[PDB]
Paper text:
With a prevalence of 25–50/100,000 people, type 1 narcolepsy (T1N) with cataplexy is a sleep disorder that currently lacks a cure. It results from the loss of HCRT-producing neurons in the hypothalamus, causing an undetectable level of HCRT in the cerebrospinal fluid. The vast majority (~98%) of narcoleptic patients carry [name]*06:02 (in association with [name]*01:02 encoding DQ6α/β heterodimers), compared to ~25% in normal individuals. Prepro-HCRT is processed intracellularly to two neurotransmitters, HCRT1 and HCRT2 known to interact with the HCRT receptors, HCRTR1 and HCRTR2, with different affinities.
We evaluated overlapping 15-mer peptides, offset by four amino acids (aa), covering the entire prepro-HCRT sequence. Nine peptides showed moderate to strong competitive binding (53–97.4% inhibition of the indicator EBV peptide) to DQ6. Interestingly, five of the DQ6-binding peptides were from highly homologous regions (iii) and (iv) at the C-terminal of each of the two processed neurotransmitters. Each region contains a NetMHCIIpan-predicted register (NHAAGILTL or NHAAGILTM), also implicated by empirical binding data. We further investigated cores of the strong-binding peptides using X-ray crystallography. The structure of DQ6-HCRT56–69 bound to DQ6 confirmed the predicted 9-aa core register (NHAAGILTL). However, the conformation of most of the DQ6 framework that would face a TCR was unchanged. The observed cross-binding capacity was also consistent with the structural similarities in these DQ6/peptide complexes.
Numbering used by the authors:
A (entry chain B): 3 to 104, 113 to 190
B (entry chain A): 2 to 183
C (entry chain C): 1 to 13
Amino acid sequence: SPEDFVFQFKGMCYFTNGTERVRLVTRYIYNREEYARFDSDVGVYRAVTPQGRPDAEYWNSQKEVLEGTRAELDTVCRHNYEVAFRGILQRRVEPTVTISPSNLLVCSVTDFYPGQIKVRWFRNDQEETAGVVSTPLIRNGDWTFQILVMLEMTPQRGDVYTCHVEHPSLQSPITVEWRA
Amino acid sequence: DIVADHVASCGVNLYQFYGPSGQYTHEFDGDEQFYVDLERKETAWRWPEFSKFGGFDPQGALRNMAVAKHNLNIMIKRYNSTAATNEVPEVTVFSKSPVTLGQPNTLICLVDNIFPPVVNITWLSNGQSVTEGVSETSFLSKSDHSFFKISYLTFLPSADEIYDCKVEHWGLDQPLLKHWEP
Amino acid sequence: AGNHAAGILTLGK
Ligand SMILES: *[C@@H]1O[C@H](CO)[C@@H](O[C@@H]2O[C@H](CO)[C@@H](O)[C@H](O)[C@H]2NC(C)=O)[C@H](O)[C@H]1NC(C)=O
Ligand SMILES: *[C@@H]1O[C@H](CO)[C@@H](O)[C@H](O)[C@H]1NC(C)=O
């Protein structure tokens, strides 16, 4: 049978509070098992599993290796934040908000970025919690998200249903109204 | 896991015995910033909007792939030639935006829990393979060290369309067809 | 204006 053997190396940068907290974690992985790791909060390599004990000891015994990996916290993580991630974190794509019936009402909130969003349903200006079904956040892979929020509905005459969308790109929440 | 406002992978280095083949990408909050074309030795962007967020000098990625190929041979012996477990991928198909007849849309096929990263993702229109209008992400990383991959099909919605996303993977006994239900 | 990247080390043993 066909088979594969996989090596993965992940140079991962974690950011909190803008630049206040920056943490580099490099991971060495065979198939799906991470066997050796450098964690900048620790400052030396660690064997995640026994199969990484040779490499931790080998790397930790070489001052040039250790200094080189420690430096990457500045030359990779802090560097790429100024070069790339600061700007990417300013990028805003406003969601498109549409209501369509199917009884059930479907609020489609599509093509927004970044991921933080809140979608609320109102009936005659009163928030509706019951009978609401929201998908998880949906990652489109093209640097946009979408989310779909359905509301179970029994409309009286003169009813106004509003879909209420708050997102970092919006000066004020988007409201889309629907009535039978 | 590690709690943090934002996570970047600088980069994801993948190298696999099957092929063999490698992949070099940088990721930010789970989306692909750029990749390196290892055959042309050129930084490239699946999403060219993001080229305004800095270039990348590709020789560092090619040096990493040389070392990755070297390291993989070492780890295969450390693990006494234990091959990758073939996971069962999980497939879902959806549209980018609400469907309106005659208004161009994009069909999205998400193949999740991919391991090993060896997969065929094809689109079927009325049971027949379609190549025009198809594109796909790289193998995107997950914290459990599996991958997901997304394929796209631009199309004009019609009343009697028949679309499937067809996925072949060693974790499947037979090709998985996921039908699109508007 | 260039992104940098972490280097893969060759292994021990
Ligand atoms: C995110 O980082 C900033 C900068 O350190 C924090 O702001 C400080 O908070 C303390 C307590 O409120 C103040 O006494 C300081 O004067 C603040 N510094 C400045 C320059 O204004 C902020 O609190 C951080 N947020 C979190 C959740 O930790
Ligand atoms: C995908 O297509 C290739 C074409 O060469 C084929 O050989 C291979 O078996 C297919 N991959 C899987 C996992 O079936």
